[PDB]
Design a protein around this ligand. Sequence first.
Ligand code: HEM
Ligand SMILES: Cc1sc[n+](C)c1C
Length: 291
Amino acid sequence: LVHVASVEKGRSYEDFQKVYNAIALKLREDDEYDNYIGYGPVLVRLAWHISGTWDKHDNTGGSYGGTYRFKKEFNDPSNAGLQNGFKFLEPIHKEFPWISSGDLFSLGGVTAVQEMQGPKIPWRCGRVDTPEDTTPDNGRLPDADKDAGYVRTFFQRLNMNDREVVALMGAHALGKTHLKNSGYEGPGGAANNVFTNEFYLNLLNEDWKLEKNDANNEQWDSKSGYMMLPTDYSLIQDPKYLSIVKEYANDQDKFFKDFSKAFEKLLEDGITFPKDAPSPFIFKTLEEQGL
Ligand code: HEM
Ligand SMILES: Cc1sc[n+](C)c1C
């Protein structure tokens, strides 16, 4: 399967910076969502789940085709709750009907991270919508109730290595688990709509307790009111993972730098970019624009 990036006709940096600003302006406006967390965390989760279907072996799935717009992927049990990120972006797609679905879903994730004061993420245009029959089947996204060997093995399919996996998981400092979506409940920290390395700090400094929640699932709970998933707590159980966790709890700039590279890589897996294709765009935030 080859997927070649095709820039939307005649579009350039300024067009996409207008779509960025639209998403970012609405993130500021619709602030009440999920008890004032706002839409940013569900939008970086949406960009990860449309990319997370990729399989390196046959180049199926991935962010290129925008296939989450089809019922099979929209109704995947693993995507429960992401309909709220879709409905947030649907106004902006009506306003810029020229951007492809893959591009709009991935740029929403980029925009949310930078607007929640994360690192800049280089983003590239050119994903092309593909037919309903190209939609990957349910079951390619990871279970939460498993251990470190499972996480390592699952992420080899998206060929991410240990460092990349641990840097990507730091995004679980954002938002929260919702019992009616996943059977897990609670936030992982106090700053859950500002991008920081707090996931790593909480994992190493809190007093975790294995408890059972109302959906009868086990999760790690702390006195402070935070929770960690079994696959999250996995990172301090494995010796290779645990020493990268310590590296990111001791250096927030290295965390930001490595997250930026692994999230772009995540969003680009499966796409062939021609050598005459434009460079990756670095978008300015509303704040750097005085907007
Ligand atoms: C083995 C890996 C992973 C598993 C099992 C997993 C699982 C989960 C689960 C069960 C939730 C709760 C959903 C809900 O109830 O609403 C969640 C939320 C979230 N995850 Fe993951 N995740 C994984 C990796 C990642 C990665 C790599 C990213 C992003 C780079 C990510 C970003 C998020 C975000 C931002 C949320 C919060 C959503 C919200 O607030 O609504 N996840 N995760
Ligand atoms: C959202 C998610 S998923 C796992 N944790 C810890 C949070 C905060």
